[PDB]
Design a protein around this ligand. Sequence first.
Ligand code: 6VC
Ligand code: 6VC
Ligand code: 6VC
Ligand code: 6VC
Ligand code: CL
Ligand code: CL
Ligand code: CL
Ligand code: CL
Ligand code: CL
Ligand code: CL
Ligand code: CL
Ligand code: CL
Ligand code: CL
Ligand code: CL
Ligand code: CL
Ligand code: CL
Ligand code: CL
Ligand code: CL
Ligand code: CL
Ligand code: CL
Ligand code: CL
Ligand code: CL
Ligand code: CL
Ligand code: K
Ligand code: K
Ligand code: K
Ligand code: MG
Ligand code: MG
Ligand code: MG
Ligand code: MG
Ligand code: MG
Ligand code: MG
Ligand code: MG
Lengths: 203, 202, 216, 220, 201, 204, 213, 196, 196
Amino acid sequence: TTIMAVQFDGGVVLGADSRTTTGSYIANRVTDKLTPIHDRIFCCRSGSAADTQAVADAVTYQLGFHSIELNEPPLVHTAASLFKEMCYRYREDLMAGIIIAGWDPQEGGQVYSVPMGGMMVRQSFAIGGSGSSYIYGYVDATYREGMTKEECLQFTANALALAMERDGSSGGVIRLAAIAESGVERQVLLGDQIPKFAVATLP
Amino acid sequence: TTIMAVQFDGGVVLGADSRTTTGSYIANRVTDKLTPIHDRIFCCRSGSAADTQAVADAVTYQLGFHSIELNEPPLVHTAASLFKEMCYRYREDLMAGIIIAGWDPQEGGQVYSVPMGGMMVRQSFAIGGSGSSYIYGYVDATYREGMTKEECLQFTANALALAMERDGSSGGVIRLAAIAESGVERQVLLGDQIPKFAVATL
Amino acid sequence: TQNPMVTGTSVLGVKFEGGVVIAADMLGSYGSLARFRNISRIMRVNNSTMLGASGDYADFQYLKQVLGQMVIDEELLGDGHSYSPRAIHSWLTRAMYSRRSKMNPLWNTMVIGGYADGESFLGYVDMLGVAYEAPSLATGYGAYLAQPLLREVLEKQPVLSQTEARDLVERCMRVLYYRDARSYNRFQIATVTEKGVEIEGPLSTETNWDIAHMIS
Amino acid sequence: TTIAGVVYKDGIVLGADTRATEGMVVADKNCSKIHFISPNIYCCGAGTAADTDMTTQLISSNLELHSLSTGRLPRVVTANRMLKQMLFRYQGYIGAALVLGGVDVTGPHLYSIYPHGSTDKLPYVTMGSGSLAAMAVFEDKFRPDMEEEEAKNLVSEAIAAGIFNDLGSGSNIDLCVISKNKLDFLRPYTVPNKKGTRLGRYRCEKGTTAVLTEKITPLE
Amino acid sequence: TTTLAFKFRHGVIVAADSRATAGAYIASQTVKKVIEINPYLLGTMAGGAADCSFWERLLARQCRIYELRNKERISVAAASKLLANMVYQYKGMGLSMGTMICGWDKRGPGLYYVDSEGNRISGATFSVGSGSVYAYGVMDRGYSYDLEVEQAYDLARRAIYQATYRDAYSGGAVNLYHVREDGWIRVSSDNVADLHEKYSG
Amino acid sequence: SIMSYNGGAVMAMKGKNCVAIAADRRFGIQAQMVTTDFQKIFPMGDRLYIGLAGLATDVQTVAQRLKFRLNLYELKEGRQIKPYTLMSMVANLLYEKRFGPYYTEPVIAGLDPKTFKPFICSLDLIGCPMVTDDFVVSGTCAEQMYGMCESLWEPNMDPDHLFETISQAMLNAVDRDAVSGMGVIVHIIEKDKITTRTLKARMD
Amino acid sequence: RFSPYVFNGGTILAIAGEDFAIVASDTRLSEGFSIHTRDSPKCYKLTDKTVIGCSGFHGDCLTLTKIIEARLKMYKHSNNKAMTTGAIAAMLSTILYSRRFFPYYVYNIIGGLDEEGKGAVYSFDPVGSYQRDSFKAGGSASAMLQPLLDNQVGFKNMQNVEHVPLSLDRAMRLVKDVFISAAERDVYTGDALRICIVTKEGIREETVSLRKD
Amino acid sequence: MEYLIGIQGPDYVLVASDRVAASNIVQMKDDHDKMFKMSEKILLLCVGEAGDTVQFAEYIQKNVQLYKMRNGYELSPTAAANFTRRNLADCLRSRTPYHVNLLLAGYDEHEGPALYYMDYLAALAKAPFAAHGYGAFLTLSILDRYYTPTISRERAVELLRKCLEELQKRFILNLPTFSVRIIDKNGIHDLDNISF
Amino acid sequence: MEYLIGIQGPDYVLVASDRVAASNIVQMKDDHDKMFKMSEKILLLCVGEAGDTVQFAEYIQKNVQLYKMRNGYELSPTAAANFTRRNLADCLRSRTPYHVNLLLAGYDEHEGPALYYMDYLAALAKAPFAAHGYGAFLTLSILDRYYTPTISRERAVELLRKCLEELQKRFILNLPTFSVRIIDKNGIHDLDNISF
Ligand SMILES: *[C@@](O)([C@H](CC(C)C)NC(=O)[C@H](CO)NC(=O)CCCCC(C)C)[C@@](C)(O)CO
Ligand SMILES: *[C@@](O)([C@H](CC(C)C)NC(=O)[C@H](CO)NC(=O)CCCCC(C)C)[C@@](C)(O)CO
Ligand SMILES: *[C@@](O)([C@H](CC(C)C)NC(=O)[C@H](CO)NC(=O)CCCCC(C)C)[C@@](C)(O)CO
Ligand SMILES: *[C@@](O)([C@H](CC(C)C)NC(=O)[C@H](CO)NC(=O)CCCCC(C)C)[C@@](C)(O)CO
Ligand SMILES: [Cl-]
Ligand SMILES: [Cl-]
Ligand SMILES: [Cl-]
Ligand SMILES: [Cl-]
Ligand SMILES: [Cl-]
Ligand SMILES: [Cl-]
Ligand SMILES: [Cl-]
Ligand SMILES: [Cl-]
Ligand SMILES: [Cl-]
Ligand SMILES: [Cl-]
Ligand SMILES: [Cl-]
Ligand SMILES: [Cl-]
Ligand SMILES: [Cl-]
Ligand SMILES: [Cl-]
Ligand SMILES: [Cl-]
Ligand SMILES: [Cl-]
Ligand SMILES: [Cl-]
Ligand SMILES: [Cl-]
Ligand SMILES: [Cl-]
Ligand SMILES: [K+]
Ligand SMILES: [K+]
Ligand SMILES: [K+]
Ligand SMILES: [Mg+2]
Ligand SMILES: [Mg+2]
Ligand SMILES: [Mg+2]
Ligand SMILES: [Mg+2]
Ligand SMILES: [Mg+2]
Ligand SMILES: [Mg+2]
Ligand SMILES: [Mg+2]
């Protein structure tokens, strides 16, 4: 797994590979790891499939009820807090590395990391999952303050393609989502649409 | 540790961080991990300091004797083969991930990886050591066929700086070497000379 | 926590005439990976008290949540009594000991600094409930690398000015950055005086790499 | 143990504490940890005491055979190679951690040598359970090209840091100063720790101890 | 530790050494290993010192409650049974205790061995502790139901003594008690160094 | 612990122009005393003794193998061994077994055969030497022995005071150790005589 | 394997006189090969007549002393009088045993006056075994202190010596001597010696410097 | 499980040993002999691990006999004990250690009777009396209680019998018969077995 | 270590048990009784782990006696054996298992004599004869060799004695005396101890 999300002025971009593994067998080649928690709040899931599905379903329930009670769209920070409380309290029994990203009217586009152990931190951009090791350098050299939506989508797709080339545990297609006040726009990059960088064969 | 070497037309560039660790204590903050094996052949060392020093000393001895006997400069491929033989034979007793790079009159600039286990492969460029994990993406996106010497030096210094920022086990100064027919040029990037990329604050 | 995940390294503290200064870098490491490079490991508890934490950052955030709610609860009463630095340190000792005694520690080592009634307070609490006070403290590698320097200065001159304590902390942060492979050259300094608690940062130490050319 | 060394303008200063321990008990209050290698080369030892003694003695002996043969003053590199090759061969089972310093035809040289056989050539080094305390002093205060007295002050400060902050280290500070012109083996350099005085006298008079049997054997 | 006891015509003799150890360190040479449960009942201590003291002190509490509730002395059988039932619940948790309960009740002289493994048994003679093997040898070769009082004291004292000689973990003083029909008495406390002088191959 | 299987204690002590060496007398196997006259101090010269504590089998082997070496040395050289030279011989013997050691930690006490200067030392089980100017201790009650020696020893003691001090240091130390004691033997070494005494001691 | 214990050092001593008790301790608090602080006494005042010395795992020393303090006030409230030295000792035995299966890693020595005004010393193992003693060392250097006390206070192994009563002045000299000797050899014992003298007039305090290495 | 005992008087050494060879829950022999004649005035009593015991004792025996044939006279008890010890100690850290416990009894023309005790580690002690096996735990105190150095040989056999009766009473193992021998100026004598 | 044996004839059951209580290398009691009277015509013989054995047997005993007091008549041997089995089996997977091995002997007015065997797992078997302990390994074949279902009580005591003599000869443990009892239409009778 490789997951990623990036803030822009007015929203967020989220991305993931699509591979589920047991050992080195690919049990699902087209997994959807970006899961909607509310209208404009998604989580990106890494670690245990069972654990992250259970936790996402529970938070969806908690956040949905909270939202009806308040009669308002939920804050992204509230979604992140609910993930954090559950990931922290059950940290000994879960294997879950999460990114929460979305939009709300109060604070705009926001990205939160909830890594294993259940800490929470807001970031400009976040990466996670085992494949993320291989793109720290890339994201650190390539990130620029003030990127547009279209630039965040390219940045994300490029980072994920690189991780997927190197990490046996990541692959398949790239799923992307952009979230803003106007809604959610999802797309898939597959085959020839995935950014491509040569293998450096010998001169 | 992070180590790297890159081929260009007429030579090679080699680079390393300068950190030696025991656990998370830094026992040497200015280690020299690029060791000369002959006039135009170096190795970059990662893994056990004891093991890679012992092996580099032994290969220097073997290659030196071989070279005097033949009355010719040694092949880069020969140096790599000698490393490989020792790293493969003693793979169960050594922790050594080596890059051999240099120049000879027959094949020009060459880079060889001898990773743990003792396989050997020639490459356009090579990275190794624990910090290399964090720059696979970077090097894959940034490498271009046909880079000049000066571009290889920048490419190397950038890759190493990024690794050193993220890997607790790498750091200190960047040591670089360029090798060509005309000789060896060494330099150190320190402090403000190390390439810089912001922490992404809110 | 049985197994710490994202972790912070050393926290330093020193008493000076009129206050206390503490220092901690801004790094959360994930094993050797310098993963979260802009996190604060220092908390303003109330006007007289501050806290710095080494160890598991999620456990630090939990303490911050609990202790933040306790000061709020107390402020609601508006009754002229506030938790002194010493009372906060006592509470912390009990909480860590209690969690140790359930075999489920909070995986932290903490430094509490304060200023109340003309007295500087500096106290240590670890994950087993070991607690004490001293004129200077350093957790983690700081205990080996910084504390010898702090104590040597304090023997020649037990009473330091604010500016002397601040310069001494900066020298220690430099040594830690040279010798601790989980450190990072971006830190905060927090100070407590009569006027309250101030947190400054992000700060960096200058470094010297002359020895790189003395392979001797 | 705290051992350390520095390269100064004209030479080497080596330093050591004088405590040896068995578990958490002091076995020797005045152990000598700075060992003769050759007239121009000395070596501080940390780790397993028998291994530091025997390893330095052996190398010193082989170096004397070397110099007798060459008719020349030995080189610090040669001691370094001999030590590291032997330690490597023993795979870390010889628990000798060494600070090797001397002055040869190519000037001053200082090396740290580890049990597994790695070595680092550096202008200042520390080893032993006190080594991080001593290293903090060096990182804070070392300058290149110090004068003899500055260098001596710095080394003893560093050893003192280990003495007072490491339970494994104690008692006296020994120094060895090596230049082209001079060798000063300063044992002790400083005695910062002193046993307190005895307040009561326990001078037991003859017959206090009851005796079952006695035999006097006269000698020549 | 070495403790012993035996029944005979004139009641029950009870004796013990006085050493305590922590590994090989001698922690004390002056431990009282015979506990006064009431004026006609004694308990002996071998194994873990805290464990013996706590559980025999609790036994003493319970015996006294029993006396107040029932208006009569608890029997040796019942007292030994109360102790056995208390410790049974803790089997396998690492209590270390070996005790003799020694009294004189309506069935006459009484003696029971009780331990943390769950054993409870009546008998004529017992020895317990690391030195018990040595005490048994000497006690066995001298024991008779028809021993005279002074001969019984001599035997008990000598058996403990010989145990302190061979067993590194036993020593100090030999403390001797005699349970008679109208109550126990403390007979003697003799330092093993003074007994060495006196005895006796 | 291998070193406590038999128990035992030795110490040596320096006075003006004399030295003293003392040992407990128990031979036992864990809790069980087997004998109360076991020898742990061995003559290596008229004025030079070695005391060994530790595993009884290695006490005997080291004494015997050391005596083999010393006898050959003295026959070949003109002369009686110096104390410092005996120490070295013993160090060399122990370090030959660096990787499968003898479990014994000796003390040496003697007078130089020509100058009569006092000498004491001890060695660890792999032959690391330590010379001192006051006392040395080895065995299962070393902490007890250190406490007595540190409190009682004074410089420049005459033979009678040296005897009282080493005797009180030994008796009171072993009385806090379950597996050492059953008697104490003391040798006082002077230029013109050796005095050997057994002490009135606890036998528990 | 999280371990809930660490060893923090500390040497304690108590001596009973005819009309006094002494309780003494070093002030070093250690962990591993490091010193936490040089000014951490191991003695705690319980009443006007009773002092307790505690060493071992500092987390437990702190907890246990706070438990004892709470229990002494509870007792005073329910019974209308301060706890005697003997009752404090009996109570401590039960508090230690209550943790029989997760012990307080603490060596305790109580020193105070008994109900006749005489010195009383009680010593404890971690699970609450105890007895009254004339004098007793505990903690890190106890095996170094105890034999010399056996000899000098107990008169053991000495012939033709008058067994005179222990004066305060001699008891004091012995205390300082044995800690000075211990500081030479035990790596954990050092910095300073804190001495509390309990008499009918109250509790007074002496401190003496020890080696800092 | 195996019991050895020795008692040395002024001019003799008395020794005894159980006669059981056991395996798992059964006695497989009830007339087993644990004594080895080394020379006219030397017995070695050997117990311990199966194979090791006989292999070790017979090797010592053959070499003691060889010494006699080579030199015309016998090793003394003390020399034989030290020879036995050198061999055991030399094997201790070898590829072939011998897990045996021993008593050596003898009579020397000039030194009189001797009894030596040796454990598997090869610690050697001279003693006035001694015993090996679990049974030693129950009998050594009986010896400490009643032994005197001038004990006559009759009384030594009585003292021996007290020890053996104590095993019948108190020891959990069934050891019903014992070999008994004595050594003096006139060599080695078989006494009647003591049986129950 | 503990031996139990039972032999059922036409109108009686004969039972015996060793009288040793041992601890480590010593017998601590030689007149120990391993039999518990449950009712006028029922004996329960119990061996196994210390504490467990007495705690279990006395609990069963008290409940069998309680049944008699509540109902005016006694449990049959078969009903008592099944009760005993229910309890042991119910504890087997609990926090408080009892590590005990048992024989239950009885006589019923209508069903005649019965002997039941139970192991610590609580498997219950009715048998014409049975035994527990390591001693069983040496005696069961003697019972298979000589037992017949019409065996008279005289010959049962002789057959019992052959078994006990075999333990003296061949068993490694010292078990010198045994309790012997018989149950028939007239209740429980003590026979002479069989001793060696
Ligand atoms: C991802 O972390 C990925 C994310 C997950 C939310 C789809 N994780 C997995 O594929 C995990 C990693 O082990 N696999 C499972 O939980 C197993 C699902 C089990 C079904 C059968 C195969 C037993 C990456 C990087 O780990 C994917 O490789
Ligand atoms: C490097 O691989 C580095 C390369 C080495 C050739 C300098 N390796 C080390 O620093 C290694 C541990 O990986 N350290 C040692 O061999 C220990 C040397 C001294 C031992 C004593 C101090 C105990 C990196 C990435 O591992 C550096 O972190
Ligand atoms: C030192 O490393 C010290 C150096 C040594 C050359 C004196 N090491 C020791 O004291 C070691 C540490 O285990 N001890 C021994 O080898 C046992 C022998 C000591 C007894 C004498 C006969 C020498 C420090 C830092 O470890 C000292 O604590
Ligand atoms: C005894 O069994 C003895 C009996 C006991 C009632 C004193 N047991 C102990 O000494 C035990 C043996 O581990 N030691 C302790 O429980 C800890 C220290 C005791 C504290 C003193 C202040 C009492 C023998 C045979 O074990 C004695 O060696
Ligand atoms: Cl896939
Ligand atoms: Cl999924
Ligand atoms: Cl994570
Ligand atoms: Cl993650
Ligand atoms: Cl993952
Ligand atoms: Cl290196
Ligand atoms: Cl590799
Ligand atoms: Cl590599
Ligand atoms: Cl590496
Ligand atoms: Cl570095
Ligand atoms: Cl961050
Ligand atoms: Cl804050
Ligand atoms: Cl070299
Ligand atoms: Cl007493
Ligand atoms: Cl009641
Ligand atoms: Cl009974
Ligand atoms: Cl015991
Ligand atoms: Cl008698
Ligand atoms: Cl030899
Ligand atoms: K892939
Ligand atoms: K780094
Ligand atoms: K000290
Ligand atoms: Mg799970
Ligand atoms: Mg290796
Ligand atoms: Mg003793
Ligand atoms: Mg004893
Ligand atoms: Mg120190
Ligand atoms: Mg074998
Ligand atoms: Mg059970």
